[PDB]
Amino acid sequence: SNVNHLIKVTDQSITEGYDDSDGIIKAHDAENLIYDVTFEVDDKVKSTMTVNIDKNTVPSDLTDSFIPKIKGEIIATGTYDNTNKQITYTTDYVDNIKAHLKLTSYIDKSKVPNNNTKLDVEYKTALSSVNKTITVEYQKPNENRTANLQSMFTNIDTKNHTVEQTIYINPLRYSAKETNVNISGNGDEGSTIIDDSTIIKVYKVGDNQNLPDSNRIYDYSEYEDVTNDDYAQLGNDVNINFGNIDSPYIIKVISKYDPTIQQTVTMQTTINEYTGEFRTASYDNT
């Protein structure tokens, strides 16, 4: 049964992942929240207790399928339930115990869509908890005249060796003529492999629709898939021809990598209809 009441918390903590950003979680830089807990297990405990991460967070950022346990001695095993951000630890071992858990967690973009979002995160252990206040700061779109875009890695499959990159195109809603986007796997720090195997989906943002600053889409279902391989021609890069556009578009890209991962997007636009003179904006992820 539930022994939450037999768990004696002796030390709790919410530590920011990076040391040059106190009070602020640079989510797009991948600043994680580390929950450190130390507690005493009463002897009456037999061969379950609970632990909760802040409602506005999740076990992993680049992975949707993500749960430690205490010990070579095995003190306990748990079960994660995202419906209520609650882990559940259940051994014959318990048959004076002390344990400490260091849990890492990330801002749940599906709930923190906008930037400069001030949140009062709290993590629970048994019947003890601890509070901290921080503000979630996301990224801004780069721009050069009518060119503008931004991108973010959104998922990583270590098994199959793949990464996902959600790109925003013309988010500020400019009238970009002759618009061209190029996704290159050849980077100044790492890389990715753009080939015939690379998957390119594309969606057009409605007039009523607003992209999420979290620069992450959870329900592509809602936007108009406008994917047409005819406009995607290979080049370690790939070019996409949008031409004259006035709306924001979404470019989801699944690609392969070497088993040092960087993907670079560039949006080019024609500033002089009579000349052919272009300007260019870029965004890379690492």
Tab-separated table of C-alpha atoms in Angstrom:
chain	number	residue	atom	x	y	z
A	1	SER	CA	0.000	0.000	0.000
A	2	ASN	CA	0.681	3.758	0.182
A	3	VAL	CA	3.317	4.564	2.771
A	4	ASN	CA	3.778	8.181	1.763
A	5	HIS	CA	3.173	8.931	5.444
A	6	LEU	CA	6.105	6.773	6.487
A	7	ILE	CA	8.542	8.680	4.261
A	8	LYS	CA	10.583	11.268	6.148
A	9	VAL	CA	11.959	14.009	3.889
A	10	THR	CA	15.307	15.325	5.146
A	11	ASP	CA	16.488	17.411	2.154
A	12	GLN	CA	14.849	18.830	-0.976
A	13	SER	CA	16.050	20.982	-3.867
A	14	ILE	CA	15.395	22.489	-7.305
A	15	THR	CA	18.675	23.189	-9.100
A	16	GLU	CA	18.941	24.964	-12.413
A	17	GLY	CA	21.001	23.097	-15.013
A	18	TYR	CA	23.131	26.067	-16.060
A	19	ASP	CA	25.072	28.433	-13.812
A	20	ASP	CA	24.957	31.623	-15.838
A	21	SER	CA	21.158	31.920	-15.855
A	22	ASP	CA	19.673	32.091	-12.351
A	23	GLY	CA	15.950	32.646	-12.080
A	24	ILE	CA	15.745	31.850	-15.789
A	25	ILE	CA	15.446	28.561	-17.600
A	26	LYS	CA	16.832	28.849	-21.107
A	27	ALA	CA	14.579	26.106	-22.495
A	28	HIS	CA	15.784	26.437	-26.039
A	29	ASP	CA	19.331	26.104	-24.789
A	30	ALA	CA	18.112	22.981	-23.060
A	31	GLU	CA	18.419	24.135	-19.435
A	32	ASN	CA	17.027	21.251	-17.335
A	33	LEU	CA	15.535	21.225	-13.848
A	34	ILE	CA	17.240	18.862	-11.457
A	35	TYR	CA	15.237	17.744	-8.441
A	36	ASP	CA	17.406	16.454	-5.655
A	37	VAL	CA	15.700	14.601	-2.781
A	38	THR	CA	16.944	12.781	0.344
A	39	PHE	CA	14.560	10.831	2.596
A	40	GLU	CA	14.373	8.257	5.450
A	41	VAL	CA	12.245	5.154	5.046
A	42	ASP	CA	10.566	3.906	8.215
A	43	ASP	CA	11.169	0.214	9.081
A	44	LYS	CA	7.430	-0.474	9.079
A	45	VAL	CA	7.745	-0.165	5.334
A	46	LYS	CA	7.241	-3.549	3.691
A	47	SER	CA	8.214	-5.273	0.463
A	48	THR	CA	4.796	2.251	-2.496
A	49	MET	CA	5.524	5.958	-2.234
A	50	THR	CA	5.120	8.752	-4.800
A	51	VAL	CA	7.096	11.612	-6.363
A	52	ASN	CA	5.876	14.499	-8.602
A	53	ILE	CA	7.722	16.741	-11.049
A	54	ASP	CA	6.269	20.208	-11.699
A	55	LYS	CA	3.070	20.167	-13.736
A	56	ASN	CA	4.730	22.386	-16.310
A	57	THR	CA	7.554	19.974	-16.933
A	58	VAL	CA	8.469	16.584	-18.331
A	59	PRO	CA	11.153	13.829	-17.933
A	60	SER	CA	12.653	14.526	-21.323
A	61	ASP	CA	12.892	17.216	-24.003
A	62	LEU	CA	14.114	15.515	-27.170
A	63	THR	CA	12.399	12.199	-26.279
A	64	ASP	CA	8.685	11.517	-25.705
A	65	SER	CA	9.408	8.007	-24.273
A	66	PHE	CA	11.003	8.611	-20.843
A	67	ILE	CA	12.700	6.592	-14.703
A	68	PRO	CA	15.524	6.075	-12.231
A	69	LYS	CA	15.574	3.984	-9.060
A	70	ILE	CA	17.508	3.969	-5.804
A	71	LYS	CA	20.379	1.738	-4.634
A	72	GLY	CA	24.299	-1.974	-5.964
A	73	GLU	CA	21.557	-2.477	-3.483
A	74	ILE	CA	18.091	-2.128	-5.102
A	75	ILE	CA	15.926	-0.015	-2.776
A	76	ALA	CA	13.045	0.743	-5.190
A	77	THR	CA	11.560	0.784	-8.684
A	78	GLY	CA	9.063	3.267	-10.131
A	79	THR	CA	6.337	3.903	-12.728
A	80	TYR	CA	5.812	7.257	-14.564
A	81	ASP	CA	2.356	8.620	-15.348
A	82	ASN	CA	2.290	11.780	-17.486
A	83	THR	CA	-1.413	12.351	-16.937
A	84	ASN	CA	-0.482	13.620	-13.478
A	85	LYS	CA	3.333	14.065	-13.636
A	86	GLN	CA	3.672	11.453	-10.877
A	87	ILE	CA	6.311	8.698	-10.604
A	88	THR	CA	5.483	5.612	-8.449
A	89	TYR	CA	8.209	3.774	-6.572
A	90	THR	CA	7.544	0.247	-5.286
A	91	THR	CA	11.622	-4.412	-2.916
A	92	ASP	CA	12.021	-7.294	-0.442
A	93	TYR	CA	15.042	-5.119	0.500
A	94	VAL	CA	13.030	-2.981	2.964
A	95	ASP	CA	12.613	-6.390	4.654
A	96	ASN	CA	17.021	2.387	9.131
A	97	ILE	CA	16.807	3.176	5.397
A	98	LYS	CA	18.023	6.325	3.652
A	99	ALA	CA	17.838	7.236	-0.069
A	100	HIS	CA	18.459	10.151	-2.399
A	101	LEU	CA	16.954	10.906	-5.844
A	102	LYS	CA	18.416	13.267	-8.439
A	103	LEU	CA	15.671	13.794	-11.062
A	104	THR	CA	16.146	15.860	-14.195
A	105	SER	CA	13.137	17.413	-15.924
A	106	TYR	CA	12.390	19.868	-18.717
A	107	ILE	CA	9.788	22.593	-19.410
A	108	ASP	CA	6.753	20.965	-21.020
A	109	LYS	CA	6.412	23.111	-24.125
A	110	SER	CA	2.898	21.913	-24.702
A	111	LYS	CA	1.963	23.842	-21.571
A	112	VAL	CA	4.463	26.683	-21.688
A	113	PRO	CA	3.956	27.955	-25.237
A	114	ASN	CA	4.830	31.609	-24.780
A	115	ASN	CA	8.048	33.392	-23.913
A	116	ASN	CA	8.942	35.106	-20.689
A	117	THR	CA	6.388	32.859	-18.954
A	118	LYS	CA	6.834	33.227	-15.179
A	119	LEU	CA	6.211	29.967	-13.389
A	120	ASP	CA	6.361	28.803	-9.766
A	121	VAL	CA	7.555	25.209	-10.175
A	122	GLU	CA	7.172	22.734	-7.317
A	123	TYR	CA	8.361	19.117	-6.828
A	124	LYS	CA	6.833	16.700	-4.365
A	125	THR	CA	8.100	13.710	-2.351
A	126	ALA	CA	5.707	11.861	-0.089
A	127	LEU	CA	3.923	14.642	1.827
A	128	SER	CA	6.814	17.123	1.543
A	129	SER	CA	7.419	19.537	-1.337
A	130	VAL	CA	9.538	22.492	-2.235
A	131	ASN	CA	8.856	25.562	-4.316
A	132	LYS	CA	10.964	27.726	-6.645
A	133	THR	CA	10.076	30.533	-9.076
A	134	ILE	CA	11.598	30.851	-12.546
A	135	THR	CA	10.710	32.302	-15.889
A	136	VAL	CA	10.736	30.304	-19.127
A	137	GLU	CA	12.454	32.101	-21.950
A	138	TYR	CA	12.228	30.796	-25.513
A	139	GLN	CA	13.930	31.994	-28.704
A	140	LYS	CA	13.240	34.708	-31.294
A	141	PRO	CA	13.212	34.549	-35.148
A	142	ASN	CA	16.267	35.768	-37.062
A	143	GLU	CA	15.670	38.164	-39.927
A	144	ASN	CA	17.118	40.057	-42.893
A	145	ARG	CA	14.610	42.304	-44.613
A	146	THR	CA	11.718	40.037	-45.659
A	147	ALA	CA	13.608	36.871	-44.881
A	148	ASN	CA	12.871	35.277	-41.549
A	149	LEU	CA	12.772	31.855	-39.986
A	150	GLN	CA	13.725	29.963	-36.847
A	151	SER	CA	14.263	26.350	-35.972
A	152	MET	CA	14.572	23.920	-33.139
A	153	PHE	CA	15.413	20.276	-32.694
A	154	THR	CA	12.216	18.598	-31.566
A	155	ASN	CA	12.958	14.873	-31.146
A	156	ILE	CA	15.894	12.501	-31.253
A	157	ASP	CA	15.828	8.751	-31.979
A	158	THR	CA	19.123	7.311	-30.752
A	159	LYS	CA	18.172	3.804	-31.823
A	160	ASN	CA	17.533	4.567	-35.497
A	161	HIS	CA	19.967	7.507	-35.326
A	162	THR	CA	17.568	10.327	-36.294
A	163	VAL	CA	16.665	13.900	-35.272
A	164	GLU	CA	13.597	16.038	-35.857
A	165	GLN	CA	13.752	19.734	-36.698
A	166	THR	CA	10.720	21.965	-36.640
A	167	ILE	CA	11.329	25.109	-38.710
A	168	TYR	CA	9.205	28.223	-38.843
A	169	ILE	CA	9.197	30.163	-42.110
A	170	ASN	CA	8.081	33.784	-42.423
A	171	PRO	CA	6.608	33.771	-38.926
A	172	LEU	CA	6.515	37.505	-38.630
A	173	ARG	CA	4.230	37.402	-41.711
A	174	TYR	CA	6.115	39.386	-44.310
A	175	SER	CA	5.409	39.211	-48.072
A	176	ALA	CA	8.443	37.185	-49.149
A	177	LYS	CA	8.750	36.919	-52.890
A	178	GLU	CA	10.749	34.120	-54.590
A	179	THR	CA	11.205	32.674	-51.128
A	180	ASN	CA	13.671	29.824	-51.006
A	181	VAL	CA	14.668	27.587	-48.115
A	182	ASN	CA	17.692	25.344	-47.920
A	183	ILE	CA	18.327	22.691	-45.273
A	184	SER	CA	21.982	21.656	-45.087
A	185	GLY	CA	23.570	18.846	-43.132
A	186	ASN	CA	27.087	20.277	-43.458
A	187	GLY	CA	27.721	22.325	-40.302
A	188	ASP	CA	30.436	24.455	-38.691
A	189	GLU	CA	30.225	22.425	-35.472
A	190	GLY	CA	28.454	19.130	-36.177
A	191	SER	CA	26.172	17.717	-38.851
A	192	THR	CA	23.314	15.612	-40.230
A	193	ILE	CA	22.788	13.566	-43.426
A	194	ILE	CA	20.408	15.043	-45.984
A	195	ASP	CA	19.711	12.427	-48.684
A	196	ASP	CA	16.862	10.779	-50.535
A	197	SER	CA	15.836	9.242	-47.218
A	198	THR	CA	15.156	12.622	-45.531
A	199	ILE	CA	11.522	13.269	-44.700
A	200	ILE	CA	10.137	16.732	-45.374
A	201	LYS	CA	6.628	17.635	-44.275
A	202	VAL	CA	5.174	21.121	-44.713
A	203	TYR	CA	2.218	23.020	-43.301
A	204	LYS	CA	0.719	26.442	-44.026
A	205	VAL	CA	-0.376	28.567	-41.060
A	206	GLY	CA	-3.897	29.932	-41.346
A	207	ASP	CA	-4.793	33.588	-40.997
A	208	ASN	CA	-6.492	32.817	-37.689
A	209	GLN	CA	-3.639	30.617	-36.438
A	210	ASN	CA	-0.678	31.639	-34.218
A	211	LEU	CA	2.517	29.564	-33.931
A	212	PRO	CA	3.810	28.585	-30.497
A	213	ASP	CA	6.920	30.381	-29.226
A	214	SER	CA	7.960	27.030	-27.795
A	215	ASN	CA	8.831	26.512	-31.443
A	216	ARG	CA	7.312	23.032	-31.111
A	217	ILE	CA	4.067	21.630	-32.622
A	218	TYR	CA	2.081	18.995	-30.697
A	219	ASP	CA	-0.895	18.590	-33.040
A	220	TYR	CA	0.073	19.008	-36.697
A	221	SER	CA	-3.435	17.834	-37.335
A	222	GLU	CA	-4.619	21.472	-37.031
A	223	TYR	CA	-2.604	23.047	-39.862
A	224	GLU	CA	-3.021	22.562	-43.643
A	225	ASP	CA	-0.471	20.015	-44.861
A	226	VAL	CA	0.800	21.488	-48.080
A	227	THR	CA	3.592	18.989	-48.688
A	228	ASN	CA	4.640	18.494	-52.370
A	229	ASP	CA	7.927	16.684	-53.098
A	230	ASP	CA	7.929	18.367	-56.473
A	231	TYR	CA	9.227	21.512	-54.781
A	232	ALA	CA	11.883	19.787	-52.709
A	233	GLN	CA	15.047	19.132	-54.777
A	234	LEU	CA	18.263	17.718	-53.345
A	235	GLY	CA	21.521	19.686	-53.607
A	236	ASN	CA	24.481	17.688	-48.279
A	237	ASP	CA	21.516	19.997	-48.517
A	238	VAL	CA	17.986	20.288	-49.917
A	239	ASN	CA	16.168	23.249	-51.461
A	240	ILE	CA	12.471	24.067	-51.168
A	241	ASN	CA	10.640	26.483	-53.480
A	242	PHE	CA	7.895	28.505	-51.833
A	243	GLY	CA	8.127	31.522	-54.132
A	244	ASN	CA	5.953	34.514	-53.266
A	245	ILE	CA	4.548	33.893	-49.719
A	246	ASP	CA	2.815	36.137	-47.136
A	247	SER	CA	2.054	33.511	-44.439
A	248	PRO	CA	4.027	31.470	-41.858
A	249	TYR	CA	4.854	27.909	-42.705
A	250	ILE	CA	5.939	24.837	-40.793
A	251	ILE	CA	8.720	22.555	-42.048
A	252	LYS	CA	9.074	19.344	-40.073
A	253	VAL	CA	12.255	17.483	-41.000
A	254	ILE	CA	13.282	14.032	-39.928
A	255	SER	CA	16.842	13.186	-40.857
A	256	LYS	CA	19.722	10.824	-40.126
A	257	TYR	CA	22.977	11.384	-38.261
A	258	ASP	CA	26.381	9.740	-37.617
A	259	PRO	CA	26.891	7.303	-34.753
A	260	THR	CA	28.269	16.256	-33.306
A	261	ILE	CA	24.745	16.801	-34.685
A	262	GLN	CA	23.991	20.122	-36.417
A	263	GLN	CA	21.448	21.100	-39.053
A	264	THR	CA	21.402	24.507	-40.847
A	265	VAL	CA	18.430	26.269	-42.413
A	266	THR	CA	18.620	29.283	-44.707
A	267	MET	CA	15.724	31.328	-46.134
A	268	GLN	CA	16.422	33.517	-49.110
A	269	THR	CA	14.227	36.224	-50.592
A	270	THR	CA	14.121	38.583	-53.615
A	271	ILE	CA	14.080	42.228	-52.445
A	272	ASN	CA	14.031	43.812	-55.963
A	273	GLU	CA	11.480	42.280	-58.323
A	274	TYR	CA	13.191	44.061	-61.239
A	275	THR	CA	16.786	43.276	-60.151
A	276	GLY	CA	16.987	39.765	-58.684
A	277	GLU	CA	18.948	40.933	-55.658
A	278	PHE	CA	18.520	38.626	-52.689
A	279	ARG	CA	19.131	38.862	-48.939
A	280	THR	CA	19.421	35.886	-46.557
A	281	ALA	CA	18.520	34.829	-43.027
A	282	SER	CA	19.835	31.747	-41.262
A	283	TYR	CA	19.274	29.495	-38.292
A	284	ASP	CA	21.241	26.467	-37.099
A	285	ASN	CA	20.599	24.067	-34.190
A	286	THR	CA	23.134	21.968	-32.270
